[PDB]
Amino acid sequence: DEHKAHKAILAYEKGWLAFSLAMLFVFIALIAYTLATHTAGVIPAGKLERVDPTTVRQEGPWADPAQAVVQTGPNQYTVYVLAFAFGYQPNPIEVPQGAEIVFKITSPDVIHGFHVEGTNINVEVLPGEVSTVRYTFKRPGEYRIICNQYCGLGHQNMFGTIVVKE
Amino acid sequence: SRVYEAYPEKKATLYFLVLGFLALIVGSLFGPFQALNYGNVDAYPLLKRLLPFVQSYYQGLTLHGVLNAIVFTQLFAQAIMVYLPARELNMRPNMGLMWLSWWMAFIGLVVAALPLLANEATVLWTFYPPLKGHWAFYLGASVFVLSTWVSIYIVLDLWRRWKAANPGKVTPLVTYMAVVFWLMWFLASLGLVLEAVLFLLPWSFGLVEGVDPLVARTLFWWTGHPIVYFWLLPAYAIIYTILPKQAGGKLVSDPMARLAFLLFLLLSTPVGFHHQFADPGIDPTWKMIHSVLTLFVAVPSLMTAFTVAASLEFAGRLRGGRGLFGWIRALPWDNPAFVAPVLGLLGFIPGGAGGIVNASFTLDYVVHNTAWVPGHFHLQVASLVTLTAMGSLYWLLPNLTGKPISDAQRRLGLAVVWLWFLGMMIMAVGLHWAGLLNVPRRAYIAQVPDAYPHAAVPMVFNVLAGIVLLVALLLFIYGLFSVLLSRERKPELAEAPLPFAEVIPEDRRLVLAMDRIGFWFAVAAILVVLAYGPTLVQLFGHLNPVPGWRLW
Amino acid sequence: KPKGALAVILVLTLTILVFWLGVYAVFFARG
Ligand code: HAS
Ligand code: HEM
Ligand SMILES: CCCCCCCC/C=C/CCCCCCCC(=O)OC[C@H](O)CO
Ligand SMILES: CCCCCCCC/C=C\CCCCCCCC(=O)OC[C@H](O)CO
Ligand SMILES: CCCCCCCC/C=C\CCCCCCCC(=O)OC[C@H](O)CO
Ligand SMILES: CCCCCCCC/C=C\CCCCCCCC(=O)OC[C@H](O)CO
Ligand SMILES: CCCCCCCC/C=C\CCCCCCCC(=O)OC[C@H](O)CO
Ligand SMILES: CCCCCCCC/C=C\CCCCCCCC(=O)OC[C@H](O)CO
Ligand SMILES: CCCCCCCC/C=C\CCCCCCCC(=O)OC[C@H](O)CO
Ligand SMILES: CCCCCCCC/C=C\CCCCCCCC(=O)OC[C@H](O)CO
Ligand code: CUA
Ligand SMILES: [O-][O-]
Ligand SMILES: [Cu+2]
């Protein structure tokens, strides 16, 4: 009864622990998969690309927002975005639909989020580093950028805009 | 008291509890306001009349984070994970050291508080650079956390002393847990300590112009993950070694219990990149490795679920319950010390489920930095840990003070426990859901009321949760003071044994392996070097410090 | 057999699965 309940409890727990292990492994396998598709483009580039946030608005690709959108492939655009207190430049970001967009994003002040509502783009932006992420906008129109890392008193109203042209 | 003459560890323990709860109360005052905010209702004008020193939603948010997630949880850990092994071993912890640890905690907390109350460190509980707080915030926080290194010493002391008087005996259960816990906490703690000493302190003192954000965050999350395990394990110790008595049964396996703890020593620390999935400059192969390891650290709680569920079922069967559901009704649902934890565990089901999603590397891009995250953790810490701590009032307080719990007090305890649980659940729904609607975490949304129209529904939950939890909190304040400030004293209560459960034979071989602690300690530390070394070496090799800012 | 314990882990497995495949579905929709 006490002896018996003990063996049966123990016996089934092993069952469970093996199933739980299986389930966890399958998630590992399903994450692995995502890693192999274009959906993985939103994972940041692990590479270090340092900049100087004190001069980034005066010199380099972030200095002139009207020139932030650069064709770098036959069907590819690189976009130099600045996230700053409290907004994003350019505003709006204008990209063609169906094209692959390499966002290269930095900050002159503090850390900001770069979360594109409606998509999987969600990347921390740190001063002194350029965050690099990739996405193909399949539907045209207006996407809101939300800052989702506390950045000071203006955090709640820090928003940007990406326009995807037909 | 003659009892404090004989068990001085009772009084130091008590001081950790009371200070802990006081931290909890003050931190928690801001909760309902935040809940109302996530429901798109702005009651800060009210808060600012009641507490005039409060300058912003984000000052309030800092206080809430720091006092609830850092201070309270720590005090609690130090109370439980020192006093419990001390009682099981029936030995006296080093009283000088225990008092030293208390004063450190109190002093550090007081110093950190000054800037917080003065609105000089409205960074948050994560204090990410280059948002730059007052030196006193970093220094007060450092000495507060360091308070735990003493606790580590205390428990290793007690441990070795017991082993010396008992050569060739396996470490006792609570003490095994307490030891693997503290050694875990040691490795874990080093990330933050490193961060504060090499970067944050010199920086805030004006010794260096700036800090590298990425290194800060990487060091931070070294500590930042295992901290949640450091918060959780005090609760688990109780859930495993006490709750089964409270429920009316026995712990169904000591080895299983040891195994879970052991796994947390090995796996709680090498996982932090799971908080850095959206960070630049961190290699994706490392993110995936850390993700896999994070799924592994789920395992000891997957285990716990079963070990504990089976123990509660056993208790329920012992008390007459039959069927698939009968053992549930049979349990001591009239007893707040049983109820609080069990309810905590119920919420922990969706809690761990959220955690699991977070861990999965690309899936994190759905929820990262949204209200989903707060949704996940309130389930884990504001609910499970907090409720477990709450229910300890009803057995630990009397054990420590000889102050008795009236029938009336018990009924209020039940009310407090249920309302808190339920309010946390309601809130949990509004947050997860708002999170999936892309609402940002850490944001004064009520001040941008037309920004999230799609969240109209989850917002009602957050408001509801908000009112329910204000009630629960109010009732916990009155509750806690009623016992604490009570008249009567029954010293037979303070001399009672703690309600440690008996264990239901056995894998002695396993227990022996698990008892080779030094070995497991090293392994765990090797895992941290393997999982953090390569990345930190590259980060330190290319530091890029940046000017700090005060945007509040 | 520990029928109740088992039922606790059923609920837990289903919760994990509703959560996980839930989010996986959302990850791809937004992809
Ligand atoms: C003490 C509190 C905490 C625990 C526990 C915790 C658990 C997990 N966490 Fe977490 N979490 C993450 C991973 C997880 C995973 C894998 C788990 C696991 O440990 C979960 C495993 C648990 C289970 C699988 C549940 C087992 C079930 C049990 C034990 C109950 C059984 C019920 C019974 C027995 C009752 C039966 C009785 C009857 C009567 C029927 C991730 C990423 O991978 C992030 C970052 C996300 C992002 O983008 O920021 C994160 C962020 C947070 C934050 C935000 C920090 C910030 O400020 O930015 C905090 C506070 C936190 C707290 C806590 N977290 N979590
Ligand atoms: C009175 C009960 C409680 C309510 C009403 C409540 C509600 C809130 C809300 C709505 C948020 C999210 C705020 C935002 O994202 O801007 C939050 C933040 C937080 N909660 Fe609580 N709170 C409760 C108690 C506690 C407890 C006991 C814990 C810890 C044990 C906890 C720790 C935290 C922390 C760490 C955060 C995140 C802070 C940050 O991002 O900086 N809460 N809670
Ligand atoms: C005992 C602890 C449990 C406490 C549970 C309490 C239940 C909450 C109240 C329900 C009545 C309905 C209230 C509706 C009346 C006013 C609502 C309203 O008008 O909304 C606010 C306003 O529009 C924007 O500021
Ligand atoms: C989509 C995926 C489908 C998921 C659907 C939910 C699955 C539930 C989880 C685990 C079932 C495992 C229960 C099988 C019983 C194990 C038997 C066992 O271990 O028993 C040993 C003992 O000796 C015998 O008397
Ligand atoms: C005892 C049984 C042993 C067998 C155990 C196997 C478990 C089966 C579950 C998942 C396999 C993973 C399938 C991976 C396919 C993913 C494809 C997908 O979801 O596609 C998304 C999107 O449409 C594309 O861009
Ligand atoms: C019990 C809790 C219940 C939980 C309830 C779940 C509800 C959330 C469901 C899906 C979120 C997915 C959101 C994906 C957003 C798609 C909107 C979109 O595509 O909008 C942008 C586009 O640019 C326009 O032109
Ligand atoms: C949308 C979410 C908000 C809604 C919240 C629902 C969440 C679950 C709540 C309670 C489950 C507790 C199940 C067990 C209940 C114990 C009571 C019982 O069995 O009582 C017997 C009687 O008192 C003899 O002692
Ligand atoms: C007596 C104990 C049981 C009572 C428990 C209550 C029942 C639970 C359901 C709803 C309460 C909702 C209260 C929320 C208060 C107002 C919500 C609000 O602000 O709604 C905005 C609206 O969607 C746009 O204007
Ligand atoms: C006993 C305690 C255990 C607690 C267990 C809680 C686990 C959460 C499970 C389900 C909630 C989700 C509700 C239904 C799923 C919503 C899906 C949905 O409607 O998706 C939106 C889609 O866009 C179409 O509009
Ligand atoms: C009971 C207390 C616990 C608190 C409750 C926590 C609620 C969150 C649970 C599950 C979310 C699972 C993800 C479900 C998202 C639904 C939408 C869906 O299924 O996605 C398809 C569609 O393409 C979309 O855009
Ligand atoms: Cu920029 Cu929040
Ligand atoms: O921390 O999860
Ligand atoms: Cu973590």
PDB file of N, CA and C and ligand atoms in Angstrom, chain A residues 8 11-16 19, chain C residues 6 9-10 13-14 17 21, ligand 4:
ATOM      1  N   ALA A   8       4.584   2.512  -7.932  1.00  0.00           N
ATOM      2  CA  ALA A   8       3.703   2.936  -9.023  1.00  0.00           C
ATOM      3  C   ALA A   8       3.859   4.411  -9.339  1.00  0.00           C
ATOM      4  N   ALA A  11       7.302   4.541 -10.999  1.00  0.00           N
ATOM      5  CA  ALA A  11       7.174   3.969 -12.333  1.00  0.00           C
ATOM      6  C   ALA A  11       6.567   4.933 -13.386  1.00  0.00           C
ATOM      7  N   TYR A  12       5.429   5.543 -13.060  1.00  0.00           N
ATOM      8  CA  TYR A  12       4.807   6.495 -13.963  1.00  0.00           C
ATOM      9  C   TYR A  12       5.581   7.826 -14.139  1.00  0.00           C
ATOM     10  N   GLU A  13       6.231   8.306 -13.085  1.00  0.00           N
ATOM     11  CA  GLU A  13       7.001   9.534 -13.184  1.00  0.00           C
ATOM     12  C   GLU A  13       8.046   9.399 -14.274  1.00  0.00           C
ATOM     13  N   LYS A  14       8.672   8.225 -14.360  1.00  0.00           N
ATOM     14  CA  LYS A  14       9.656   7.929 -15.436  1.00  0.00           C
ATOM     15  C   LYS A  14       9.003   8.024 -16.812  1.00  0.00           C
ATOM     16  N   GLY A  15       7.819   7.428 -16.940  1.00  0.00           N
ATOM     17  CA  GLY A  15       6.991   7.613 -18.139  1.00  0.00           C
ATOM     18  C   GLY A  15       6.950   9.085 -18.538  1.00  0.00           C
ATOM     19  N   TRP A  16       6.269   9.873 -17.704  1.00  0.00           N
ATOM     20  CA  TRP A  16       6.214  11.331 -17.808  1.00  0.00           C
ATOM     21  C   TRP A  16       7.536  12.055 -18.155  1.00  0.00           C
ATOM     22  N   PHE A  19       8.391  11.366 -21.712  1.00  0.00           N
ATOM     23  CA  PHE A  19       7.502  12.041 -22.632  1.00  0.00           C
ATOM     24  C   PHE A  19       7.841  13.520 -22.645  1.00  0.00           C
TER      25      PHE A  19
ATOM     26  N   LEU C   6      -1.216  11.957 -12.928  1.00  0.00           N
ATOM     27  CA  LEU C   6      -1.279  11.882 -14.372  1.00  0.00           C
ATOM     28  C   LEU C   6      -2.179  12.957 -14.980  1.00  0.00           C
ATOM     29  N   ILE C   9      -0.572  16.248 -15.084  1.00  0.00           N
ATOM     30  CA  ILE C   9       0.407  16.423 -16.177  1.00  0.00           C
ATOM     31  C   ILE C   9      -0.221  16.444 -17.577  1.00  0.00           C
ATOM     32  N   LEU C  10      -1.440  15.915 -17.681  1.00  0.00           N
ATOM     33  CA  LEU C  10      -2.196  15.981 -18.944  1.00  0.00           C
ATOM     34  C   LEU C  10      -2.473  17.486 -19.158  1.00  0.00           C
ATOM     35  N   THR C  13       0.626  19.274 -20.060  1.00  0.00           N
ATOM     36  CA  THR C  13       1.076  18.987 -21.422  1.00  0.00           C
ATOM     37  C   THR C  13       0.209  19.740 -22.443  1.00  0.00           C
ATOM     38  N   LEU C  14      -1.097  19.794 -22.182  1.00  0.00           N
ATOM     39  CA  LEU C  14      -2.014  20.447 -23.084  1.00  0.00           C
ATOM     40  C   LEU C  14      -1.807  21.960 -23.036  1.00  0.00           C
ATOM     41  N   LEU C  17       1.325  22.697 -25.004  1.00  0.00           N
ATOM     42  CA  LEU C  17       1.092  22.523 -26.393  1.00  0.00           C
ATOM     43  C   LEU C  17       0.199  23.611 -26.977  1.00  0.00           C
ATOM     44  N   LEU C  21       2.480  25.588 -29.976  1.00  0.00           N
ATOM     45  CA  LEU C  21       1.942  25.593 -31.323  1.00  0.00           C
ATOM     46  C   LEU C  21       1.108  26.823 -31.569  1.00  0.00           C
TER      47      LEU C  21
HETATM   48  C1  LIG D   4       0.303  16.043 -30.383  1.00  0.00           C
HETATM   49  C2  LIG D   4       1.007  15.125 -29.397  1.00  0.00           C
HETATM   50  C3  LIG D   4       0.031  14.221 -28.637  1.00  0.00           C
HETATM   51  C4  LIG D   4      -0.067  14.579 -27.148  1.00  0.00           C
HETATM   52  C5  LIG D   4      -1.339  14.044 -26.473  1.00  0.00           C
HETATM   53  C6  LIG D   4      -1.236  13.994 -24.952  1.00  0.00           C
HETATM   54  C7  LIG D   4      -0.187  12.978 -24.494  1.00  0.00           C
HETATM   55  C8  LIG D   4      -0.095  12.865 -22.969  1.00  0.00           C
HETATM   56  C9  LIG D   4       1.335  12.739 -22.438  1.00  0.00           C
HETATM   57  C10 LIG D   4       1.936  11.580 -22.101  1.00  0.00           C
HETATM   58  C11 LIG D   4       1.257  10.212 -22.215  1.00  0.00           C
HETATM   59  C12 LIG D   4       2.033   9.073 -21.527  1.00  0.00           C
HETATM   60  C13 LIG D   4       1.134   8.045 -20.809  1.00  0.00           C
HETATM   61  C14 LIG D   4       1.516   6.593 -21.158  1.00  0.00           C
HETATM   62  C15 LIG D   4       1.660   5.659 -19.940  1.00  0.00           C
HETATM   63  C16 LIG D   4       3.122   5.328 -19.581  1.00  0.00           C
HETATM   64  C17 LIG D   4       3.246   4.001 -18.820  1.00  0.00           C
HETATM   65  C18 LIG D   4       4.324   3.996 -17.750  1.00  0.00           C
HETATM   66  O1  LIG D   4       5.311   4.708 -17.751  1.00  0.00           O
HETATM   67  O2  LIG D   4       4.027   3.072 -16.786  1.00  0.00           O
HETATM   68  C19 LIG D   4       5.053   2.291 -16.172  1.00  0.00           C
HETATM   69  C20 LIG D   4       4.417   1.301 -15.197  1.00  0.00           C
HETATM   70  O3  LIG D   4       5.323   0.225 -14.906  1.00  0.00           O
HETATM   71  C21 LIG D   4       3.136   0.728 -15.793  1.00  0.00           C
HETATM   72  O4  LIG D   4       2.467   0.001 -14.765  1.00  0.00           O
END
